[PDB]
Amino acid sequence: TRKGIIEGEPTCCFECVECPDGEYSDETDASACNKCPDDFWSNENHTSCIAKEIEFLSWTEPFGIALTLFAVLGIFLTAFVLGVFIKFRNTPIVKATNRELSYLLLFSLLCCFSSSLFFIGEPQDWTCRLRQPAFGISFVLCISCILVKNLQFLLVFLCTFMQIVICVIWLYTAPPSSYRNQELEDEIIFITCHEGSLMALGFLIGYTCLLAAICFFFAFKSRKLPENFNEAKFITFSMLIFFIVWISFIPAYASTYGKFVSAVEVIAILAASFGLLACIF
Amino acid sequence: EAKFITFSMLIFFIVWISFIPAYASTYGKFVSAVEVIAILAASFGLLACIF
Amino acid sequence: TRKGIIEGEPTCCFECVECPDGEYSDETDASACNKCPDDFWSNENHTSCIA
Ligand SMILES: COc1cccc([C@@H](C)NCCCc2ccccc2Cl)c1
Ligand SMILES: [Ca+2]
Ligand SMILES: [Ca+2]
Numbered sequence: 115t116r117k118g119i120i121e122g123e124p125t126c127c128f129e130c131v132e133c134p135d136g137e138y139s140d141e142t143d144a145s146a147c148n149k150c151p152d153d154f155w156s157n158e159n160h161t162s163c164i165a166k167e168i169e170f171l172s173w174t175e176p177f178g179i180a181l182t183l184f185a186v187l188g189i190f191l192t193a194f195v196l197g198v199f200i201k202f203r204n205t206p207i208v209k210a211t212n213r214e215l216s217y218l219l220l221f222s223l224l225c226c227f228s229s230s231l232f233f234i235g236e237p238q239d240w241t242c243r244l245r246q247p248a249f250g251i252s253f254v255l256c257i258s259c260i261l262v263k264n265l266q267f268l269l270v271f272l273c274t275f276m277q278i279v280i281c282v283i284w285l286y287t288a289p290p291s292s293y294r295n296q297e298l299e300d301e302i303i304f305i306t307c308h309e310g311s312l313m314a315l316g317f318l319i320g321y322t323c324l325l326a327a328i329c330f331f332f333a334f335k336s337r338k339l340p341e342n343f344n345e346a347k348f349i350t351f352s353m354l355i356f357f358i359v360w361i362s363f364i365p366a367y368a369s370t371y372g373k374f375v376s377a378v379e380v381i382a383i384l385a386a387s388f389g390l391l392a393c394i395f
Numbered sequence: 396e397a398k399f400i401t402f403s404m405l406i407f408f409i410v411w412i413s414f415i416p417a418y419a420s421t422y423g424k425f426v427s428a429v430e431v432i433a434i435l436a437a438s439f440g441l442l443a444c445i446f
Numbered sequence: 447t448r449k450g451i452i453e454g455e456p457t458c459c460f461e462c463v464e465c466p467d468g469e470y471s472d473e474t475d476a477s478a479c480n481k482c483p484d485d486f487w488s489n490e491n492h493t494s495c496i497a
Binding site: 354355358359362363365366369370371372373374375377378381382385 | 402405406409410412413414415416417419420421425428429432436
Binding site: 117118119120121123124125128131134145146 | 449450451452453455456457460463466477478
């Protein structure tokens, strides 16, 4: 507490007044309350300084363990599919479905599933730098590989090179960085990332969504050919799932406040990937 | 009508799974906004898929 | 703002300390800041409280 003034009476007479939040009194007969040191907050008794709680999406939360379980299951399923394809090689269907392109697609799907682990845990600097470009490049490679499905590799590498060059331009000009946000609550510090260049993120998302749209159009144009077990139908379905996932992702990200924002991405990515894999494999 | 029922169920499930995090950590009008959006999306998906 | 004791000095000598949030003072030469009523809150200038 701190000493008050009964106006009209001498200085030897005072009244004790409670020190407010963000202030404390650690001395007998104090006149003013000291402000807490930065990254510290007054306790309930207003006499000492507890540490401000650091908040992020941890691995101990049930949400984190659930997302990790789903990601590991996706990785296992992709590896299982790749092993089955490589074991039953030189067979009619596998050789009919462009073995090499299928292997590249499965590797890129493994990359897509592994790229979701950068959005979980305390965000360090390199994780914030590698969060978006990994998924962007991997999914662009996936989409191009499906679209193409030698000359094929030359065709497939160009879109990935475009994505790589825009990503490296982004990282050279203004890279993201970690941020210890202190505005959302006076007793909690939220550790997040911060995309330095919004234009690069928008361009990356738009390029991916344009490739998806082109693939969807070419799949719907040929939705009745029965070649290769009628893969056009399932490519159409995969593109539809992708578009639904991201169109529903927009409001989910817009409405979320706090750490759980990261969660939504770890959801959306996974969902999209899963759909794709199933419909094609 | 197998395809349409399956797609409607997918729309419903994807919408709610995506909106779970927003429901877990939000207080205010955005809760009602999420409710209305998730109801309208499901109803529109069902109608469009079926009829 | 409110009066603040300077230790070892007579009552006529004091300091001016700004009132914190949720409390206000609407007079000159104030000793203790008041408390805004229920459903009110002090303004930025802390000269009154609005609903
Ligand atoms: C086309 O689909 C994608 C292509 C690249 C990245 C992604 C996901 C992983 N992040 C979206 C970025 C969402 C966003 C928008 C504005 C401000 C901050 C943020 Cl964080 C999706
Ligand atoms: Ca007197
Ligand atoms: Ca004296």
